Amino acid sequence: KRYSREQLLLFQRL
Amino acid sequence: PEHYIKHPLQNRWALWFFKNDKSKTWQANLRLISKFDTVEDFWALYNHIQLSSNLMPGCDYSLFKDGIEPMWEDEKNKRGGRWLITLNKQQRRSDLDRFWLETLLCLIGESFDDYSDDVCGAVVNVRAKGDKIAIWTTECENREAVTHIGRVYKERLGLPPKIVIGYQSHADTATTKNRFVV
Ligand SMILES: CN1CN([C@@H]2O[C@H](COP(=O)(O)OP(=O)(O)OP(=O)(O)O)[C@@H](O)[C@H]2O)c2nc(N)[nH]c(=O)c21
């Protein structure tokens, strides 16, 4: 299970 | 764009706090705060605790994999070391919080491929003399892993090619030279 910076940062926003 | 499922992380992580109290032994001042294993639970913890730039000098945060205490003495740290980012006082405002968050994302995101298994965790030291962020890895003789981690981490922090960061063994830190440099 891997997530990029952008995918992780997206959930802070959503 | 999913509707109800949470997003599991590869590992369960523990956030630790350290409060500087010179009347105590070093490891008595470590408090385990909380643990999480999803992206949503990470953000919910992050948004509910202070930015490292607002902590008192002498304090630390550490994010480590579940079961690894953020100390040299742990079986997963004793043979290891750290990629060290040093900051002066005047970069606290501008760099500390965004570097620390970037480091958290490298950890929970498993950003070092196969070599993310070598990652134990990370520590931010807020200090009056100058703050430090580091990624702690399990084995300082895993040259392929240590070097890939540091190369990717420097790239992820966005640091110039002419600022060089160092990897220190915990055995050397305890008694510092660098084993590797990038
Ligand atoms: C990470 N540490 C730090 N530490 C104690 O805390 C002291 C300061 O370590 P630090 O907080 O990592 O750095 P800092 O406060 O900037 O001090 P310095 O500039 O001397 O490194 C060390 O000299 C050591 O005695 C430790 N002691 C034990 N037993 N195990 C550990 O894992 C650690």
Residue numbers in the entry:
A (entry chain B): 3 to 15, 101
B (entry chain A): 31 to 205, 211 to 217
Quoted passage from the original study:
Two 15mer peptide derivatives of sTIP-05 (sTIP-09: 1KKRYSR*QLL*FRRR15 and sTIP-10: 1KKRYSREQLL*FQR*15) were synthesized, one with an “13RRR15” sequence extension and the other with an i, i + 4 hydrocarbon staple shifted to positions 11 and 15 of the peptide sequence which encapsulates the “12FQR14” sequence at the C-terminus. In sTIP-10, position 7 was substituted by a glutamic acid (E7) as is seen in the sequence of the parent eIF4G1 peptide. Significantly though, their rates of dissociation decreased relative to sTIP-05 and hence residence times were improved (68 seconds for sTIP-09 and 39 seconds for sTIP-10). The crystal structure of sTIP-10 with eIF4E showed that the helical content of this peptide was relatively higher than in the other peptides because the i, i + 4 hydrocarbon staple stabilized an additional helical turn in the extended C-terminus of the peptide. However, this staple linker was still exposed to the solvent as observed in the other crystal structures, with no interactions made with the protein. The side-chain of Q13 behaved similar to W13 in sTIP-07 and R13 in sTIP-09, forming hydrogen-bond interactions with N77 and hydrophobic interactions with residues W73, Y76 and L131. Residue R14, being exposed to the solvent, did not form any specific interactions with eIF4E but should contribute to peptide solubility. MD simulations of the sTIP-10 and eIF4E crystal structure showed that the peptide maintained the additional helical turn observed at the C-terminus primarily because of the stability provided by the hydrocarbon linker. Residue Q13 in the extended terminal segment contributed favorably (–2.0 kcal mol–1) to binding through its predominantly hydrophobic interactions with eIF4E along with the core residues (Y4, R6, L9, L10 and F12; –2.1 to –6.9 kcal mol–1) in the peptide.
